[PDB]
């Protein structure tokens, strides 16, 4: 065998920062631009709890026009970053629909996932931290606030998702 690879998928409503979070992780880079995604793919070699591994990251469309592609990438993906923006309440309520579609496609009640509240550098939040922490607890998953701009939580969010995958694969 060789180095383990983890198929990670970043999902959430349009404009919450899925692509910015991925680009910050992979390239250590941030630019404020409007570039809606259809489907992008990245890779990075990292060390998590001493084990070198390969992250294969799929960055998906938040625009509902591309909603038909979800079934394929949810079958392939091993773990999911469910991203909302802390200044966009509708994106937080949209998390439910993503989670429910993933569970249905994978036919399982416990799929590796992490709840990500992005744009934590911005003022004027509308989703309070406790609300999001309480939802993640009801889902049984980790929660992390992130900023693609300041790098707050970025590595942690992807590393935590890998740890969740590793716990699932043993169970």
């Amino acid at each position: 065998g060789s180095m383990t690879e983890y198929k990670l998928v970043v999902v959430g409503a349009g404009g919450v920062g899925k692509s910015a979070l991925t680009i910050q992780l992979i390239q250590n880079h941030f630019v404020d631009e409007y570039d809606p995604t259809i489907e992008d793919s990245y890779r990075k070699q990292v060390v998590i709890d001493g084990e070198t591994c390969l992250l294969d990251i799929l960055d998906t469309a938040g625009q509902e026009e591309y909603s038909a592609m979800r079934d394929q990438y949810m079958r392939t993906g091993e773990g999911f970053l469910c991203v909302f923006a802390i200044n966009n309440t509708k994106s937080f309520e949209d998390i439910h629909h993503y989670r429910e579609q993933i569970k249905r496609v994978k036919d399982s009640e416990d799929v590796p996932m992490v709840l990500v509240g992005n744009k934590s550098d911005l003022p004027s939040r509308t989703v309070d931290t406790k609300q999001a922490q309480d939802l993640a607890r009801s889902y049984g998953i980790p929660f992390i606030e992130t900023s693609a701009k300041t790098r707050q939580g970025v590595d942690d969010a992807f590393y935590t998702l890998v740890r969740e995958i590793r716990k699932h694969k043993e169970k």
Partner: protein
């Protein structure tokens, strides 16, 4: 009419590909321009680049510079293309 194509570049930047939309009316110059924007390529003019379809392990199809892409591409294989400097 339209379809999704995947565009890669050769830079070791950790990107495997980014997808863009292709229409039956696009010619190669407009596709190269859309690909370059997606990959943040702006220091060169579009004429230095070519668009290349991956057909198999050891065959590629250079899309001609003034062709309709729907007509010139191989519709029978995955829609993966490389954007690279001539």
């Amino acid at each position: 009419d339209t379809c999704i194509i995947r565009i890669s570049v050769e830079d070791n930047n950790g990107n495997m590909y980014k997808s863009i939309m292709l229409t039956s009316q696009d010619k190669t110059p407009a596709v190269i321009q859309r690909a370059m924007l997606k990959h943040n390529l702006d220091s060169d003019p579009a004429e230095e680049y070519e668009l290349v379809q991956v057909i198999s392990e050891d065959k590629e199809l250079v899309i001609p510079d003034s062709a309709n892409v729907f007509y010139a591409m191989n519709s029978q294989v995955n829609f993966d293309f490389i954007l690279r400097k001539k």
